[PDB]
Amino acid sequence: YVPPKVWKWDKANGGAFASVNRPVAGPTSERELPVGKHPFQVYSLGTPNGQKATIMLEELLQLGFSEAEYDAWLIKIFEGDQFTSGFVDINPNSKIPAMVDRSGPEPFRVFESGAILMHLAEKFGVFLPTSGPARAECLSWLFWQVGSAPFIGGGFGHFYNYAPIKIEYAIDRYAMETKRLFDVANRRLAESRYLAGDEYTIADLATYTWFGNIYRGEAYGEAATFLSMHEYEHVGRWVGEIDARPGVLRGRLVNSSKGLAERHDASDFDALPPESLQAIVKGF
Amino acid sequence: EYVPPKVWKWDKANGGAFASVNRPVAGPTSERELPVGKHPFQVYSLGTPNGQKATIMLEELLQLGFSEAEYDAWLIKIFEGDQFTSGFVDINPNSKIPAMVDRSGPEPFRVFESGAILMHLAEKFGVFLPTSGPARAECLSWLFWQVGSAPFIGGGFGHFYNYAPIKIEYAIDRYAMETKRLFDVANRRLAESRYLAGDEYTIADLATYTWFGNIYRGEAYGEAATFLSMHEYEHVGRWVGEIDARPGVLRGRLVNSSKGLAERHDASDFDALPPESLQAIVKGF
Numbered sequence: 001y002v003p004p005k006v007w008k009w010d011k012a013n014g015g016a017f018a019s020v021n022r023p024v025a026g027p028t029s030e031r032e033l034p035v036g037k038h039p040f041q042v043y044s045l046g047t048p049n050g051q052k053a054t055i056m057l058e059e060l061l062q063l064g065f066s067e068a069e070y071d072a073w074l075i076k077i078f079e080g081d082q083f084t085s086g087f088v089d090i091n092p093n094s095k096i097p098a099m100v101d102r103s104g105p106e107p108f109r110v111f112e113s114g115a116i117l118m119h120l121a122e123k124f125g126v127f128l129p130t131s132g133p134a135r136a137e138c139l140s141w142l143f144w145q146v147g148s149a150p151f152i153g154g155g156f157g158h159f160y161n162y163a164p165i166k167i168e169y170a171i172d173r174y175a176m177e178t179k180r181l182f183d184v185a186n187r188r189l190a191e192s193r194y195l196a197g198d199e200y201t202i203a204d205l206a207t208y209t210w211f212g213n214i215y216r217g218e219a220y221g222e223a224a225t226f227l228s229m230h231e232y233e234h235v236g237r238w239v240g241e242i243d244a245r246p247g248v249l250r251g252r253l254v255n256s257s258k259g260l261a262e263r264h265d266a267s268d269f270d271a272l273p274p275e276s277l278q279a280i281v282k283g284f
Numbered sequence: 285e286y287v288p289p290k291v292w293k294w295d296k297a298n299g300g301a302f303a304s305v306n307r308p309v310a311g312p313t314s315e316r317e318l319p320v321g322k323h324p325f326q327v328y329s330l331g332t333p334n335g336q337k338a339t340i341m342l343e344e345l346l347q348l349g350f351s352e353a354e355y356d357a358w359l360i361k362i363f364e365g366d367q368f369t370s371g372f373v374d375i376n377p378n379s380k381i382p383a384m385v386d387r388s389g390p391e392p393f394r395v396f397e398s399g400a401i402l403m404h405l406a407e408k409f410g411v412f413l414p415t416s417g418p419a420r421a422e423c424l425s426w427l428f429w430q431v432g433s434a435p436f437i438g439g440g441f442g443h444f445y446n447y448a449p450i451k452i453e454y455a456i457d458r459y460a461m462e463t464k465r466l467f468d469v470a471n472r473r474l475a476e477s478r479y480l481a482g483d484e485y486t487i488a489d490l491a492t493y494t495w496f497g498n499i500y501r502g503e504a505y506g507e508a509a510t511f512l513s514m515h516e517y518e519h520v521g522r523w524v525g526e527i528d529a530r531p532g533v534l535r536g537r538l539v540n541s542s543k544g545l546a547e548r549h550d551a552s553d554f555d556a557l558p559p560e561s562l563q564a565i566v567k568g569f
């Protein structure tokens with residue numbers, strides 16, 4: 001194989017995502033989004049990125065902020081729901097999560113999980129230092145997470161778990177980088193309880209959804225063995241602490257095949273068996 | 285066909301040119317302190333698109349008269365492992381450029397990641413980022429979009445098309461397709477808006493412009509502009525052309541660059557270059 005002078009879209013690419021991945025953006029059909037009664041309207045799926053948004057909102061509800069009540073509407077990314085006119089209008093990039101803030105007289109969109117986390121942390125004044133050097137430390141780790149997850153999911157996850165052919169050079173490239181990123185976190189968590197200081201912030205939440213899912217064996221087949229996750233004992237400590245947070249236990253279940261399809265009221269969780277909200281096990 | 289082992293082992297080089305630095309472990313590999321100059325901001329960087337975000341931002345602030353944005357930009361040679369000295373790891377645990385130390389107050393502190401540097405500076409000086417209101421959310425959305433998507437352009441497309449030792453059709457196709465999709469996102473936005481997050485230039489534009497302009501104008505990744513049909517993105521081209529004319533862009537692009545200044549330690553340093561370099565875009569080597 002020799003790359004052509006001009007790339008053309010003529011072959012399938014993406015494995016399980018080959019029915020949605022395209023070289024062009026924009027909507028593929030006309031459909032409006034549903035709107036509920038609560039101030040925050042979230043359009044998402046319970047992947048690590050969706051979980052950032054729904055955990056953040058559940059964290060705010062644990063603190064008593066009624067302005068954080070939310071409707072979490074299901075977006076099925078294997079089905080192309082991210083390409084409806086209504087979804088593209090709230091996220092031009094056609095990825096979950098995306099949100100509409102309806103808490104004021106004029107609604108507006110917020111897209112990208114990092115922007116959603118920042119927006120909510122700034123609105124309520126929690127989980128992000130409002131000023132001082134600690135703010136810069138938190139932002140540094142949050143942007144680090146956003147800039148590095150593509151290597152873990154779009155790189156390692158894709159080539160290890162979804163690509164139709166196993167490609168040694170690509171698997172090696174992204175397995176190596178994923179381990180390096182876990183080592184960055186592990187070395188930080190050897191010296192600090194949380195990534196950006198002594199307290200849990202949005203930088204921890206953002207990293208945790210990805211790292212905990214991989215570390216505890218729930219993501220990408222046998223990846224936890226493949227990547228020698230046992231090496232990262234400080235990551236493990238921090239995953240265990242965050243796993244225990246009530247807002248994490250609730251938020252991780254939203255838009256999830258193992259939890260709630262959607263969330264429209266706090267009482268929706270009463271439909272689940274009590275075991276679904278109990279401690280995330282660590283052993284085998 | 286290849287069969288992955290049960291447990292991954294680091295048994296083969298990976299990275300092409302970058303195989304002399306890419307590792308599955310983090311942390312410092314030598315003890316060396318960072319140099320420190322006289323100015324309030326100390327930047328440790330290289331004039332890649334990500335380094336240019338930092339140096340352009342500082343030059344934009346100096347363009348507005350903010351003397352508190354004066355800076356030393358020290359060169360970090362990423363092919364040679366300068367990013368793994370103890371001094372550099374101390375300011376960026378992730379060992380990537382740009383990173384900086386804010387020495388403007390009584391206690392210095394690190395800021396790492398280009399997006400965090402842009403936000404830190406925009407918040408400090410109250411410019412290039414709406415301080416409140418729905419426009420702030422729009423700006424942050426586009427800025428995080430840039431940071432979350434550049435890995436597909438550089439770590440995906442650029443790597444497989446330009447650096448990997450073997451041309452891998454599936455990987456080149458995956459990331460060429462995604463790079464084009466991201467250009468199309470920007471192109472469709474810029475068809476309806478002068479800038480990404482509204483009518484005015486913000487840090488979201490600066491962050492995206494360094495990458496998109498370098499690819500679009502033909503200076504990144506060999507023949508990528510022809511390969512990716514850059515001529516298709518006329519609104520990206522219009523926006524690149526507008527940002528190209530800003531003096532802070534023209535100066536900041538030249539910092540830590542093999543076609544500009546190796547380092548910046550004072551505003552007069554630019555008088556070492558041909559004067560035309562400050563007046564029109566210079567394409568990198």
Ligand SMILES: N[C@@H](CCC(=O)N[C@@H](CS)C(=O)NCC(=O)O)C(=O)O
Nearest residue numbers: 047049077095096097112113114432
């Ligand atoms: N940088 C983005 C990444 C979001 C992302 O990868 N979303 C995925 C699910 S986790 C998605 O919606 N993919 C749809 C698609 O690629 O078509 C963020 O942090 O929100």
Ligand SMILES: N[C@@H](CCC(=O)N[C@@H](CS)C(=O)NCC(=O)O)C(=O)O
Nearest residue numbers: 014017021047049149150153154432
């Ligand atoms: N178009 C995407 C569809 C899959 C997708 O969006 N995956 C998510 C995780 S479910 C991902 O890798 N997100 C990267 C990030 O968060 O930056 C692809 O082909 O990789």
Ligand SMILES: N[C@@H](CCC(=O)N[C@@H](CS)C(=O)NCC(=O)O)C(=O)O
Nearest residue numbers: 147332334362380381382397398399
């Ligand atoms: N998300 C990071 C990406 C920074 C990045 O990719 N830095 C590259 C040069 S542009 C680097 O220093 N690479 C060194 C290495 O990989 O060893 C940011 O926006 O700052």
Ligand SMILES: N[C@@H](CCC(=O)N[C@@H](CS)C(=O)NCC(=O)O)C(=O)O
Nearest residue numbers: 147299302306332334434435438439
């Ligand atoms: N370790 C890196 C070294 C090269 C590198 O860091 N490249 C930069 C551009 S020079 C990149 O793609 N950064 C991704 C980003 O900005 O998110 C690799 O092999 O990809």
